Amino acid sequence: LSSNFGAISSVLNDILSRLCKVEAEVQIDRLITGRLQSLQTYVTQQLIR
Amino acid sequence: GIAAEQDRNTREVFAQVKQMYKTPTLKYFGGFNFSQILPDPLKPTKRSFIEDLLFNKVTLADAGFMKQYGECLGDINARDLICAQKFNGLTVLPPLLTDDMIAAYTAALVSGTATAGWTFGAGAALQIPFAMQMAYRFNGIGVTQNVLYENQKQIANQFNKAISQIQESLTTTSTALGKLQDVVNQNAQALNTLVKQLSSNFGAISSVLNDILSRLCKVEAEVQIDRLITGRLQSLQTYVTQQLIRAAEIRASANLAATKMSECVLGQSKRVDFCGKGYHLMSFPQAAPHGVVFL
Amino acid sequence: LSSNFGAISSVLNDILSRLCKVEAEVQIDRLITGRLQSLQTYVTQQLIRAAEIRASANLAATKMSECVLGQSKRVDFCGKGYHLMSFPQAAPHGVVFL
Amino acid sequence: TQHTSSMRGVYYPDEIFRSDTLYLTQDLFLPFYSNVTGFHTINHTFGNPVIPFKDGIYFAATEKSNVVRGWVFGSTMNNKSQSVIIINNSTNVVIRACNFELCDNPFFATMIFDNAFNCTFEYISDAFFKHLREFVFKNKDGFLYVYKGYQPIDVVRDLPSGFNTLKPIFKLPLGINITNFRAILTAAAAYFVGYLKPTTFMLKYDENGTITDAVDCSQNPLAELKCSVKSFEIDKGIYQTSNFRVVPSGDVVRFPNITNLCPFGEVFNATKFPSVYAWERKKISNCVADYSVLYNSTFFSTFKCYGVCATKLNDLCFSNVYADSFVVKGDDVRQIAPGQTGVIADYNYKLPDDFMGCVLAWNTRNIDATSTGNYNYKYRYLRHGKLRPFERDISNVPFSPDGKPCTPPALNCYWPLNDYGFYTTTGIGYQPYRVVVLSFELLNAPATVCGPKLSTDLIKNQCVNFNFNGLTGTGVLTPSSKRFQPFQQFGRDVSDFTDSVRDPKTSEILDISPCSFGGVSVITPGTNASSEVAVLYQDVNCWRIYSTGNNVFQTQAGCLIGAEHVDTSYECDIPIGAGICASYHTQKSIVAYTMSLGADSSIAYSNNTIAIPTNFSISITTEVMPVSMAKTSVDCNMYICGDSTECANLLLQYGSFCTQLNRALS
Amino acid sequence: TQHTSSMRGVYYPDEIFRSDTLYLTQDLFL
Amino acid sequence: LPSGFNTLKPIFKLPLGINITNFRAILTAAAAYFVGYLKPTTFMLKYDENGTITDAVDCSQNPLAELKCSVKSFEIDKGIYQTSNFR
Amino acid sequence: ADYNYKLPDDFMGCVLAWNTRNIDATSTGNYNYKYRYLRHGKLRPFERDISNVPFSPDGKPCTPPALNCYWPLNDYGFYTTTGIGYQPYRVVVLSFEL
Amino acid sequence: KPTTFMLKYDENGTITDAVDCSQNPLAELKCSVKSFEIDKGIYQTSNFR
Amino acid sequence: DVSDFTDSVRDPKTSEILDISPCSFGGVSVITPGTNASSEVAVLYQDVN
Ligand SMILES: C=CC1=C(C)/C(=C/c2[nH]c(/C=C3N=C(/C=C4\NC(=O)C(C)=C4C=C)C(C)=C\3CCC(=O)O)c(CCC(=O)O)c2C)NC1=O
Ligand SMILES: CCCCC/C=C\C/C=C\CCCCCCCC(=O)O
Ligand SMILES: CCCCC/C=C\C/C=C\CCCCCCCC(=O)O
Ligand SMILES: *[C@@H]1O[C@H](CO)[C@@H](O)[C@H](O)[C@H]1NC(C)=O
Ligand SMILES: *[C@@H]1O[C@H](CO)[C@@H](O)[C@H](O)[C@H]1NC(C)=O
Ligand SMILES: *[C@@H]1O[C@H](CO)[C@@H](O)[C@H](O)[C@H]1NC(C)=O
Ligand SMILES: *[C@@H]1O[C@H](CO)[C@@H](O)[C@H](O)[C@H]1NC(C)=O
Ligand SMILES: *[C@@H]1O[C@H](CO)[C@@H](O)[C@H](O)[C@H]1NC(C)=O
Ligand SMILES: *[C@@H]1O[C@H](CO)[C@@H](O)[C@H](O)[C@H]1NC(C)=O
Ligand SMILES: *[C@@H]1O[C@H](CO)[C@@H](O)[C@H](O)[C@H]1NC(C)=O
Ligand SMILES: *[C@@H]1O[C@H](CO)[C@@H](O)[C@H](O)[C@H]1NC(C)=O
Ligand SMILES: *[C@@H]1O[C@H](CO)[C@@H](O)[C@H](O)[C@H]1NC(C)=O
Ligand SMILES: *[C@@H]1O[C@H](CO)[C@@H](O)[C@H](O)[C@H]1NC(C)=O
Ligand SMILES: *[C@@H]1O[C@H](CO)[C@@H](O)[C@H](O)[C@H]1NC(C)=O
Ligand SMILES: *[C@@H]1O[C@H](CO)[C@@H](O)[C@H](O)[C@H]1NC(C)=O
Ligand SMILES: *[C@@H]1O[C@H](CO)[C@@H](O)[C@H](O)[C@H]1NC(C)=O
Ligand SMILES: *[C@@H]1O[C@H](CO)[C@@H](O)[C@H](O)[C@H]1NC(C)=O
Ligand SMILES: *[C@@H]1O[C@H](CO)[C@@H](O)[C@H](O)[C@H]1NC(C)=O
Ligand SMILES: *[C@@H]1O[C@H](CO)[C@@H](O)[C@H](O)[C@H]1NC(C)=O
């Protein structure tokens, strides 16, 4: 959960405190897609086990 | 690969015998009533009375596998799920073996059991009257054959009564065939989830390519289209992975059904609780939607 | 490995020779995520194939135990007919029972 | 007359060496077995009309005595536009792009032009049926590309069949409108013309890096399958290809019927603009906004749009149009933008972060600036908080930093408005500028301010391209039974696909459907056996088929075309489905039949007879089973970032994913 | 005095026709 | 105030640009009026075949409504469901 | 950008411009520079239009001393004393491949 | 030199040990698994560079 | 290549053709006992004689 997935930071508070709304909305989606991918990988491994 | 395996499962379960025995005209073999598990030449259907109930218990989605274009443009007010799936590139292919073919296979198996016994799996069928076959089955579980030959009326009556109870149990609405309904429910839910997941914008301006191409400018539109492309590709990949795992589960079940048909319909088994609760005497197969029912 | 995954090019040398550092760092991450996704897909397919191979190997082990080391009463578990004997032979990635 | 281009006219797509690969590309190509037009010298008749140039041509000349000498490319072809002449005058190859008076009968033995002026491009080369000379001409981004190829032939009448790859020789920077062309002959020969289309090809390279074979992916379903699997060889079986598609035929444009030109003069040319603290808003409605009437008189120093590319502003229609007007100084024009700070953006006029519209500003030193000094424009510089977007503050109340009311002749009490002092002799950062901000919405609501695009008649029950108020697409339009409310214009699915529209001229509701529908399977034997295939279409009753061929008949699986139905039943090797199977049997052909379940047998039940075996046989049966597969390992660092330090540094924070992959493989 | 708003005061969130769907939205509601 | 469900339609979108913090009603010189306050909330709305809103689910009312908004359905089968964690 | 000189969307190159008020502007007024303001369509990228033909909105040929018939080229009027938005600038566009 | 290190922190927030990831293949393995302890066995490390 | 890797070049001074190859090649495995026993390891290199 500490990967930034090619964004400014891995902390949503840092992005929302400093960046500006349209620019922050394109950095939040990278973290959203990365964390969704992590959950999907966990679920697939669990199904095989 | 998944679809080819689905054809192979049915072939490995139902097509074990090589020659198709005809249904005998007489259904009454020494006290035992085989009329409810064999086809009769008077009804329009090609299948037995119990298989009719089994196909009535399970509701299907695709009646046929043919939805014409004029039919989907004739049904727009009724938001049909199949038209929505087909307009987005998702299709369902017919099985190779028709239900009539599977019914013919099960009829051949039941006729061979009732006339030849256990010998048509090892090789050529050997005829034997049904009372003697019952005597050998009784002798196989450690009971002498005079017990059969002196109580034949009672055993025949109990067999007929048990068949009637099986018939009465399947006419009342219940969840006996509930793990065959789960398969079709899971398939329908997966396809509908693919259809509904197509409205996510995946962090873009819109989820509609027409809106992006009508308003945005070419280099800026080419970076918004790739987000939708990657999102929809990810959705298809997730669907394919779930389908592969479900196919593995179905293949394990079909392997168990094939070995159970081999060791319990074509012979008598010594394995405890492998075919019913008690000392195994016989088994009969019946076809069901996407599956098999052993009695 | 020749997909650009929505970037300028699929070659890192072309991006680093021409684009500028902050702009190159947002084009390299697309290639990184795409290639990581490709490796993950390969690993998932390999795990599923390994499960199928393991089921086959378990069946081969129990067949060697119950048909080469003894005589089986199970119908059609080892050949068509009444089982008398079995002999194993090695094969590339597998076993052949006679 | 009419001939066919049998695998004719392939060229090198780029300047990159490739060997022993299959390359898939999409470009302007001559499609396989397409129509070509022949021009022959039957008699003294000089056959050379003006042939139209439709985004590139393939030209072939079959020659024995060098009759065709060059070409003229142009648009008007008289004296009014630029034209380019490419000829060989038996000593040089000369290319000349000028503005010259053409002749009705241009020929050699040099009569091509009466006179020439305003010459733009010049190129002179170096000094210097049996022949076939092939050319590809294409125009793109002000460049004329020429590709050339040569072949010795012996044919006397027709264009010979074969395959030959053309190489680039010229890339001329002309910048010329090319719509028409004409060949130049000498005073016994033939030439052939074909047209290029946007197409996907798959090309094969040798070990010498030469193109020797290609596959046109849109010729027939077998070629679609070949391009899908990226191989020239297909094994025996049945393959699910792409679904059945039709191409759009017509165009439909439906816009609201508006007559009035939209009031540019009343907005941009007004005698009086307000101050920035008291900015004014005006609604714009029922007008045609083409803005090309401003190219004669009015010019803007800044013009910036947000939410839409400017080049599409003539193809759209706008829903809720408002215009804000005010006056600032030159140094404050940069503050009229989203996400900005300063006195104007904080206390006078603020734009939203998700703003959609345009900002226009122009210098007005000759109207709002006097030599004495214009002091009629004001701005607020003191406030107790920032403004919200599109919020106005009008009050003139004395300001105190602590926050309590005060009397202006006192201490720590100020007047919150300052004057702009506009002089003629000041620098440009202190000169007045007039600013207009336009705000609107796009493609989600009823609209009444549109562009100058012309409308078109409606077409029903046919795959067309459509444009409703700027929303474009491809589909089939049918009358609908939905009941829109007066504030609604569009309708959407559960998957956010626009499926209903209200026609803006006659207020009827229309349903939109996709054009492609229905699964298609291709049944083939091995590629070694034949190039013939059979096609099975689900969802059609035997229409919506690619070709009718021979032997079309209905099965339980679908409509089968290209196979013959036989009454006898066998085992099957190609499973079609629903009990139907196919095979390749005898002249060989593809046959379809019902599969056989097994052998017929009869044993009779008796209550007193038994059957006993008398003899036996010993049998040995083989059974093969897999046990293991190949053990494999990957290295993320080399696969993702091969010998690059910067990529490895960027990858350094993805290490958990790679250790997870390595654990799975081990 | 004090009363309760029992499923009171729902409005149309946009100007787009929808039929036979369930739509999830986030806005200022009672 | 009677109970029930009734959907409201847009009639006005006025471009005022005014700081609005207070309001007051105007009466004639026997009647009642009721005031409630809006909150930022997630709803789930149901449409008819005529395109009319006839039912809704407020996703923050109780855990059953949270479950309904999570599964996107108005009907829940018998069983036990893991909802969102306690906030 | 519509009638005189258009750049491609995927342009690669550089644009340079500088003020030239001391060379191309006179006190009397330099009227030797022209631009087109009337056309029946937009230009394609890197396309040139040279013709000087009378323009009619309906689209038919006409004689310039008539009604609804214009000359399609306007003069730039470059003076020394004007503001900087009306001063001449020299522009060079470089295009290449990499 | 430009180098990748792995540092260990105490419960007092003090650095008391480190691993230089480019010293020898054992240190490469330690930095790959992110641990100071390796169990007995054979491990596929990075390819030869 | 087939993977879009630049593998050949023409030298711009003398018009000869040159092949470009990567520098890293060959798998490496590390055999270790437990970290408690020793810090000594054995290294197995495939693809070298
Ligand atoms: C029309 C423009 C035109 C172009 C672009 C052109 C290009 C061209 N002409 C060539 C040779 C040649 N080209 C021709 C003749 C012709 N080839 C033609 O396309 C035509 C129309 C003629 C008729 C005059 C001949 C006779 C040779 C020399 C063949 C030889 O060397 O044996 C070559 C090969 C050069 C080489 O030998 O290495 C090229 C690339 N020739 C042209 O005439
Ligand atoms: C005055 C009412 C205008 C209403 C138009 C509403 C929407 C149309 C959107 C943009 C129109 C731009 C007009 C100015 C273009 C200037 C072009 C230029 O020279 O750079
Ligand atoms: C002189 C010491 C300044 C130190 C301030 C340090 C950090 C604060 C960051 C930015 C302050 C910007 C000050 C100028 C703002 C001008 C606003 C305008 O009119 O456009
Ligand atoms: C049992 O057999 C008799 C024939 O004697 C038949 O009439 C009867 O229908 C059979 N039972 C059932 C339930 O069909
Ligand atoms: C090509 O010419 C044939 C006549 O031989 C004609 O039938 C066909 O329609 C033409 N092709 C196209 C695309 O029009
Ligand atoms: C010049 O090209 C334009 C499109 O760029 C076209 O509309 C016009 O008709 C062409 N000129 C002639 C004379 O055909
Ligand atoms: C262009 O050609 C035409 C041909 O009729 C001629 O009348 C006209 O004068 C020519 N223009 C020039 C500038 O020479
Ligand atoms: C061909 O054209 C060139 C171009 O000017 C000229 O120099 C040459 O003399 C011409 N050849 C003949 C035979 O006229
Ligand atoms: C084209 O030629 C005419 C004379 O016929 C001339 O007046 C005009 O300036 C020329 N155009 C260009 C762009 O040189
Ligand atoms: C490749 O080039 C060599 C050398 O000219 C030639 O001998 C060989 O035939 C070529 N390959 C093919 C497939 O033609
Ligand atoms: C452009 O302006 C000039 C000068 O006022 C005028 O003569 C000309 O007719 C105008 N053009 C149009 C098309 O109105
Ligand atoms: C603006 O209006 C004034 C008076 O109405 C007029 O003199 C002036 O020419 C107009 N300017 C433009 C650019 O139309
Ligand atoms: C113009 O629009 C009105 C409003 O929809 C419509 O009634 C009328 O038919 C339209 N005019 C024509 C000529 O169709
Ligand atoms: C196809 O059409 C014929 C007559 O048009 C009809 O008899 C037949 O049932 C149809 N096939 C199907 C599968 O509906
Ligand atoms: C049948 O048995 C006899 C003796 O038991 C033997 O000679 C004969 O070979 C057997 N039949 C066959 C076909 O082998
Ligand atoms: C939809 O509209 C029709 C026509 O007014 C009406 O009869 C029907 O009752 C409506 N549907 C519902 C669910 O009220
Ligand atoms: C952490 O700090 C405490 C207090 O100084 C000390 O007693 C303890 O030893 C420290 N921990 C270590 C590992 O040195
Ligand atoms: C300069 O380049 C030419 C062309 O390749 C080459 O022949 C020559 O050797 C070069 N000069 C030197 C000093 O190498
Ligand atoms: C290693 O090299 C030796 C001699 O250099 C040779 O005999 C041996 O076969 C080689 N090993 C392998 C695996 O090739």
Q: D36 φ, ψ to 5°?
A: -130, 150
G2 DSSP 8-state letter? -
Pocket test for ligand 5, best of D4, D5, D34, D35 (most atoms within 8 A of CB): D35
C60 and D625 in contact by Cβ < 8 A? yes
CA distance D77 to D179: 10
Question: Per 3-state DSSP, what percentage of chain E is helix, strand, and coil (rounded to 5)?
Answer: 0, 40, 60
By C-alpha distance, the chain A residue nearest B240 is A44
Note whether H45 and H25 are within 8 A (CB): yes
Q: What are phi and psi of B182, to 5 degrees?
A: -65, -30
What phi and psi, each to the nearest 5 degrees, are found at residue E6? -85, 95
Q: CB neighbours (10 Å) of residue F24?
A: 5
Token pair recorded at residue F60 = 């923050």
Residue in this structure with the two tokens 């009027």, named with its chain if needed: G77
Token readout for D233 is 């060889």
DSSP summary character for residue D118: E
Measuring from each residue's beta carbon to the nearest atom of ligand 11, which residues come in under 6 Å?
A: D 296; G 70
- The CA D300 to ligand 12 mean position distance, Å, reads 15
Cβ-Cβ pairs closer than 8 A, H with I, add up to 52
Contact by Cβ (8 Å): F11, F19? no
Count CB atoms within 10 A of the CB of residue D541: 11
Cβ-contact I25, H48 below 8 angstroms: yes
Distance CA F42, CA F58 (A): 7
CA I11 to chain CA centroid, Å, is 25
* H/E stretch holding A24: helix A21-48
Distance CA C2, CA I7 (A): 14
Q: Which of G78, G79, G59, G77 is nearest to G69 (CA)?
A: G59
Q: Is B204 on the interface with C (CB under 8 A)?
A: no
D505 lines ligand 13 (CB under 6 A): yes
Q: What does the alpha-carbon distance between residue B65 and residue B96 come to, in Å, rounded to a whole number?
A: 12
Q: Which two tokens stand for residue D464?
A: 């067309």
Q: Which of C36, C53, C59 sits opposite D654 (nearest CB)?
A: C36
DSSP designation for D295 = G
CA of I13 to the centre of ligand 18 (A): 5
Give, in order, the Cα–Cα distances in Å from D7 to each of B254, D147, D233, D533.
Answer: 50, 16, 18, 20
Amino acid at D422: F
Three-state SS at D640: helix
CA distance E25 to chain F (A): 6
Q: How far apart are the first and last CA of chain G?
A: 26
Residue B174 burial by Cβ neighbours in a 10 Å radius (0-12, 13-18, 19+): exposed
Of the candidates D561, D543, D560, the one whose C-alpha atom is nearest the C-alpha of residue D246 is: D543
Residues D390, D355 contacting (CB under 8 angstroms): no
CA atoms within 13 A on the CB side of I6: 11
Contacts of residue D220, defined as CB under 8 A and 6 or more positions apart, other chains included, come to D533, D546
Residue nearest to atom 35 of ligand 1 (CA): D169
Nearest by Cα to D73 from D107, D96, D93: D96
Rounded Cα distance between D209 and D17, Å, is 6
Q: Nearest C-alpha to atom 12 of ligand 7 is from which residue?
A: D79
Q: If you measure CA to CA, which chain D residue comes closest to B4?
A: D575
Sheet holding D534-537, edge to edge: D237-240, D520-524, D534-537, D559-561, D552-554
- Phi, psi (rounded to 5 degrees) for D303: -150, 110
Q: How far is CA C69 from the centre of its chain?
A: 31
D247: left (phi over 0), alpha (psi -120 to 50) or beta: beta
Matching residue, tokens 């689905």: B6
List chain F residues with CB under 8 Å of E27: 40-41, 43
Asked whether at least 3 C-beta pairs link E and H within 8 Å, the reply is no
Distance in angstroms (rounded) separating the CA atoms of residues D74 and G47: 13
Q: Mapped to the 3 state alphabet, what secondary structure does D164-215 carry?
A: CEEEEEEEEECCCCCCEEEEEEECCCEEEEEECEEEEEEEEECCCCCEEEEE
Cα–Cα distance for residue pair D521/D564, rounded to 1 Å: 17
| β-bridge mates for residue B207, sequence order | none
Look-up: residue for tokens 């797509």? Answer: D13
Range of the domain at D118: 2-245
Q: CA–CA separation, B134 vs B143, rounded Å?
A: 11
Return the DSSP state at D296. T
- Other beta carbons within 10 angstroms of residue E5's beta carbon come to 12
- Residue written as tokens 């039912």? F55
Neighbours of D651 (CB within 10 A): 21
Three-state SS at B46:
coil
Give the DSSP H or E segment for D223. helix D221-229
Question: Is B26 part of the contact surface with chain D (CB cutoff 8 Å)?
Answer: yes
Q: Among D592, D590, D576, D591, which residue's Cα sits nearest to residue D530?
A: D590
- The pairs formed by C86-94 with CB atoms below 8 angstroms and a separation of 24 or more are C88/C64, C91/D624, C93/D626, C93/D627, C93/D628, C93/D629, C94/C60, C94/D624, C94/D625, C94/D626, C94/D627, C94/D628
Contacts of D431 (CB under 8 A, 6+ apart): D329, D330, D363, D365, D369, D422
Please name the amino acid found at residue H14. Answer: T
On whether any CB of chain D is under 8 Å from the CB of I2, the answer is yes
Q: Could you give phi then psi for residue D480, rounded to 5 degrees?
A: -120, 165
CA distance A44 to chain B (A): 8
Is the Cβ pair D487, F9 closer than 8 Å? yes
D229 pocket-lining for ligand 8 (C-beta < 6 Å) = no
D83 and D99 Cβ atoms separated by less than 8 Å: yes
Of the candidates B279, B60, B97, the residue with the CA atom closest to the CA atom of residue B177: B60
- With contacts defined as CB-CB under 8 Å, which chain C residues touch I2? 2
Rounded CA-CA distance D503/D243 in Å is 31
* Longest alpha-carbon distance in chain B: 94
**Does residue G26 sit in helix, strand or coil?**
strand
Give residues with Cβ within 8 angstroms of B69, minimum separation 6.
Answer: D517, D518, D539, D540, D544
Cα–Cα distance measured from residue D81 to residue G50, given in angstroms and rounded to the nearest whole number: 7
Separation CA D420–CA D410 (nearest Å) = 24
- Residue-by-residue DSSP string for B84-143: HHHTTT---PPPSS-HHHHHHHHHHHHHHHHHTTTTTTTSS-----HHHHHHHHHHHTT-
Tell which atom from ligand 7 comes closest to the C-alpha of D101: 2
Contact C33, A37 (CB under 8 A): no
Q: How far is residue B79 from each of residues B84, D243, D404, D493, D502, measured CA to CA in Å?
A: 8, 22, 65, 9, 20
Q: What is the CA radius of gyration of chain A?
A: 13
Report how far residue C36's alpha carbon sits from residue D636's, in angstroms, rounded to the nearest whole number: 8
C2 touches chain I (CB under 8 A): yes
Task: Tell me if B196 sits within 8 A of E21, measured CB to CB.
Answer: no
Residue D335 Cα: closest atom of ligand 3: 20
Q: Where are the alpha helices (DSSP H) in B47-89?
A: 49-57, 69-74, 81-86
Measured between alpha carbons, how far is B223 from B201 in angstroms, rounded to an integer?
13
Which is it for the CA torsion D365, D368, D374, D375, positive or negative?
negative
Instruction: Considering every ligand atom shown, identify the ligand nearest to the alpha carbon of residue F47 and give its number.
Output: 16
Q: Which residue of D has its CA nearest to A21?
A: D353
Tell me phi and psi for residue D641, to 5 degrees. Answer: -130, 85
In terms of Cβ atoms closer than 10 Å to its own Cβ (0-12, 13-18, 19+), residue D615 is exposed
- D296/G45 Cβ within 8 A: no
**CA atoms within a 13 Å half-sphere pointing along the CA-CB vector of D632:** 11
Helical pair B49-57 and B152-171, crossing angle rounded to 10 deg: 30
Query: Which residues, 6+ apart, have CB-to-CB distance to C23 below 8 Å?
Result: none
- Tell me the chain C residues in contact with residue B263 when contact means C-beta distances shorter than 8 Å: 74-77
Cα F65 to its chain centre, rounded Å, is 13
Q: What is the rounded CA–CA span in Å between residue D467 and residue D474?
A: 9
CA distance linking residue C33 with residue C40, whole number of Å: 10
* Among B130, B135, B134, residue whose Cα is nearest residue B116: B130
Tokens of E19: 């039929």
Give kind and range of the element (H or E) at residue D664. Answer: helix D655-665
Minimal C-alpha gap between A21 and chain D (Å):
7
CATH number at residue D200: 2.60.120.960
Instruction: Tell me whether C51 touches chain A (CB under 8 Å).
Output: yes
CB of C59 within 8 A of CB of D625?
A: yes
CB B95 within 8 A of CB B86: no
Task: Provide the shortest C-alpha distance from residue D294 to chain B (in Å).
Answer: 23
Provide the pairing of β-strand D93-102 with D70-74: unpaired
d(CA A34, CA A1): 9
Report the alpha-carbon distance of residue B222 to residue C30 in Å, rounded: 14
CA–CA gap between residue D275 and residue D379 (Å, rounded) = 7
E8 and chain F: CB distance < 8 Å anywhere?
Answer: yes
Kindly list the distances between the CA atom of residue D140 and the CA atoms of D98, D110, D175, D198, D422, in Å, as whole numbers in the listed order. 19, 30, 9, 13, 51
Half-sphere exposure of D346 (CA within 13 A, CB side): 10
Helices A21-48 and B218-264, axial angle in degrees (round to 10): 10
Q: Is the CB of D93 under 6 A from ligand 8?
A: no
B137, B281 contact by CB (below 8 A) = yes
Residue carrying the six token digits 């004057």? D419
Contact E19, F50 (CB under 8 A): yes
Q: CA–CA separation, D519 vs D521, rounded Å?
A: 7
Looking at residue B262, its amino acid is S
| Torsion angle in degrees (nearest 10) through CA of D406, D411, D413, D418 | 150
Q: What single-letter amino acid sits at G4?
A: N
Q: How far apart are CA B259 and CA D311, in angstroms?
A: 70
The two structure tokens encoding residue G54:
């009378």
DSSP-assigned letter for residue D339: T
In the chain, the amino acid numbered D524 is T
| Spatial distance between the Cα atoms of D325 and D267, rounded to a whole number of angstroms | 8
Å resolution of this model?
2.6
**C-alpha pair distances (Å), D473 with each of B42, B218, D464:** 58, 17, 8
Determine which residue's CA is closest to atom 5 belonging to ligand 18: I13
Query: What DSSP character marks residue G84?
Result: G
Which whole-number Å values give the CA distances from B24 to B28, B100, B160, D603, in the listed order?
10, 18, 19, 9
- Nearest neighbour of D353 by CB, restricted to A2, A4, A20: A20
> Is residue D454 within 8 Å of D240, Cβ to Cβ?
no
DSSP-derived 3-state class of residue D491: strand
- ∠ at Cα C73 (C70, C74), nearest 5°? 110
Cβ neighbors of D32 (< 8 A, separation 6 or more) are D5, D6, D7, D216, D219
- Name which of A24, D81, A23 is nearest A11 in CA terms: A24
Distance from Cα B268 to the centre of ligand 5, integer Å: 71
Query: D456, D254 in Cβ contact below 8 A?
Result: yes
Cβ neighbours of I4 in C, within 8 Å: 1-2, 10-11
Q: Ligand 7: which atom is nearest the Cα of residue D78?
A: 2
Query: Using CA positions, which residue lies closest to atom 7 of ligand 12?
Result: D269
D591 CB-near residues (< 8 Å, 6+ apart): D563, D564, D565, D566, D582, D583, D584, D585
Query: CA separation (Å) from G30 to D591, D593, D631?
Result: 85, 89, 81
What is the phi/psi pair of residue C9, to 5°?
A: -150, 170
Residues of chain D with C-beta less than 8 angstroms from the C-beta of I27: 633
Which residues in chain A have their CB less than 8 angstroms from residue C48's CB? 48
Nearest residue to B269 (alpha-carbon basis) of B110, B141, B126, B114: B141
At D185, phi and psi to the nearest 5? -120, 170
Chain C meets chain E (3+ C-beta pairs below 8 A): no
In chain H the first and final C-alpha atoms are separated, in Å, by 18
Pocket flag, ligand 16, residue F50 (CB < 6 Å): yes
Hey, how many other C-beta atoms are within 10 angstroms of the C-beta on B79?
A: 15
Q: What are phi and psi of B211, to 5 degrees?
A: -65, -40
Query: Among all residues of chain D, which has the CA nearest to that of G45?
Result: D141
